[PDB]
Ligand binder design. Sequence first.
Ligand SMILES: COc1ncc(-c2nc3c(n2C(C)C)[C@H](c2ccc(Cl)cc2)N([C@@H](C)c2cccc(Cl)c2)C3=O)c(OC)n1
Length: 86
Amino acid sequence: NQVRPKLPLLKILHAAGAQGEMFTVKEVMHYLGQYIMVKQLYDQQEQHMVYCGGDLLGELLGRQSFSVKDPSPLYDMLRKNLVTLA
Ligand SMILES: COc1ncc(-c2nc3c(n2C(C)C)[C@H](c2ccc(Cl)cc2)N([C@@H](C)c2cccc(Cl)c2)C3=O)c(OC)n1
Protein backbone atom coordinates (compact mmCIF):
# COMPACT_ATOMS: atom_id res chain seq x y z
CA ASN A 1 0.00 0.00 0.00
CA GLN A 2 2.96 2.30 -0.67
CA VAL A 3 2.84 4.51 -3.76
CA ARG A 4 5.60 6.34 -5.60
CA PRO A 5 4.41 9.51 -7.34
CA LYS A 6 5.64 10.40 -10.86
CA LEU A 7 8.09 13.32 -10.84
CA PRO A 8 5.76 16.26 -11.48
CA LEU A 9 3.41 15.06 -8.72
CA LEU A 10 6.35 14.40 -6.41
CA LYS A 11 7.45 18.02 -6.95
CA ILE A 12 3.97 19.20 -5.94
CA LEU A 13 3.98 17.11 -2.74
CA HIS A 14 7.41 18.39 -1.72
CA ALA A 15 6.28 21.98 -2.31
CA ALA A 16 3.56 21.37 0.30
CA GLY A 17 6.06 20.08 2.88
CA ALA A 18 6.24 16.35 2.11
CA GLN A 19 9.55 14.54 2.65
CA GLY A 20 10.94 11.53 0.82
CA GLU A 21 9.37 9.81 -2.14
CA MET A 22 7.30 6.88 -0.86
CA PHE A 23 3.84 7.67 0.50
CA THR A 24 0.48 6.30 1.50
CA VAL A 25 -2.45 7.53 -0.60
CA LYS A 26 -3.70 9.28 2.57
CA GLU A 27 -0.43 11.23 2.75
CA VAL A 28 -0.66 12.10 -0.96
CA MET A 29 -4.17 13.53 -0.50
CA HIS A 30 -3.10 15.37 2.65
CA TYR A 31 -0.20 17.12 0.92
CA LEU A 32 -2.20 17.87 -2.24
CA GLY A 33 -4.78 19.57 -0.04
CA GLN A 34 -2.04 21.54 1.69
CA TYR A 35 -0.58 22.51 -1.72
CA ILE A 36 -3.93 23.92 -2.80
CA MET A 37 -4.05 25.93 0.43
CA VAL A 38 -0.47 27.31 0.30
CA LYS A 39 -0.71 28.16 -3.45
CA GLN A 40 -4.11 29.86 -2.90
CA LEU A 41 -5.84 27.79 -5.59
CA TYR A 42 -9.13 27.46 -3.68
CA ASP A 43 -12.10 29.82 -4.10
CA GLN A 44 -12.67 31.52 -0.73
CA GLN A 45 -16.26 32.50 -1.69
CA GLU A 46 -17.21 29.23 -3.44
CA GLN A 47 -15.31 26.75 -1.30
CA HIS A 48 -16.05 23.78 -3.51
CA MET A 49 -13.93 25.14 -6.37
CA VAL A 50 -10.22 24.71 -7.07
CA TYR A 51 -8.78 26.89 -9.84
CA CYS A 52 -5.66 25.04 -10.92
CA GLY A 53 -5.22 26.38 -14.48
CA GLY A 54 -1.69 27.77 -14.99
CA ASP A 55 -0.36 25.78 -12.05
CA LEU A 56 1.47 22.48 -12.50
CA LEU A 57 -1.52 20.85 -10.78
CA GLY A 58 -3.77 22.01 -13.63
CA GLU A 59 -1.30 20.62 -16.12
CA LEU A 60 -1.47 17.18 -14.45
CA LEU A 61 -5.27 17.25 -14.31
CA GLY A 62 -5.62 18.64 -17.83
CA ARG A 63 -8.08 21.11 -16.31
CA GLN A 64 -8.50 24.78 -15.51
CA SER A 65 -10.71 23.97 -12.53
CA PHE A 66 -12.33 21.21 -10.55
CA SER A 67 -14.97 20.88 -7.85
CA VAL A 68 -14.42 18.94 -4.62
CA LYS A 69 -18.02 17.79 -5.08
CA ASP A 70 -16.77 15.62 -7.95
CA PRO A 71 -13.45 13.93 -7.12
CA SER A 72 -13.44 11.89 -10.38
CA PRO A 73 -10.96 14.04 -12.37
CA LEU A 74 -8.56 14.23 -9.41
CA TYR A 75 -8.80 10.52 -8.69
CA ASP A 76 -8.23 9.70 -12.39
CA MET A 77 -5.09 11.87 -12.32
CA LEU A 78 -3.88 10.05 -9.20
CA ARG A 79 -4.44 6.64 -10.81
CA LYS A 80 -2.20 7.71 -13.70
CA ASN A 81 0.45 9.41 -11.56
CA LEU A 82 0.90 6.91 -8.75
CA VAL A 83 2.87 3.68 -8.87
CA THR A 84 1.63 1.11 -6.33
CA LEU A 85 4.32 -1.18 -4.95
CA ALA A 86 3.68 -4.64 -3.49
C1 LIG B 1 -11.17 28.20 2.23
O1 LIG B 1 -11.50 27.54 1.00
C2 LIG B 1 -11.35 26.17 1.00
N1 LIG B 1 -11.01 25.49 2.13
C3 LIG B 1 -10.88 24.15 2.08
C4 LIG B 1 -11.10 23.48 0.87
C5 LIG B 1 -10.98 21.98 0.79
N2 LIG B 1 -12.02 21.29 0.65
C6 LIG B 1 -11.62 19.92 0.63
C7 LIG B 1 -10.29 19.98 0.77
N3 LIG B 1 -9.90 21.24 0.87
C8 LIG B 1 -8.53 21.76 1.04
C9 LIG B 1 -7.64 20.88 1.96
C10 LIG B 1 -7.86 22.07 -0.33
C11 LIG B 1 -9.73 18.57 0.74
C12 LIG B 1 -8.86 18.34 -0.53
C13 LIG B 1 -7.74 17.49 -0.49
C14 LIG B 1 -6.97 17.28 -1.66
C15 LIG B 1 -7.32 17.90 -2.87
CL1 LIG B 1 -6.36 17.64 -4.33
C16 LIG B 1 -8.45 18.73 -2.92
C17 LIG B 1 -9.20 18.95 -1.75
N4 LIG B 1 -10.98 17.80 0.59
C18 LIG B 1 -11.02 16.33 0.59
C19 LIG B 1 -12.01 15.77 1.64
C20 LIG B 1 -11.25 15.60 -0.73
C21 LIG B 1 -11.40 14.20 -0.69
C22 LIG B 1 -11.61 13.49 -1.86
C23 LIG B 1 -11.65 14.18 -3.08
C24 LIG B 1 -11.50 15.57 -3.12
CL2 LIG B 1 -11.57 16.44 -4.63
C25 LIG B 1 -11.30 16.29 -1.94
C26 LIG B 1 -12.11 18.56 0.52
O2 LIG B 1 -13.28 18.25 0.37
C27 LIG B 1 -11.44 24.20 -0.26
O3 LIG B 1 -11.67 23.53 -1.45
C28 LIG B 1 -12.02 24.31 -2.61
N5 LIG B 1 -11.57 25.53 -0.16
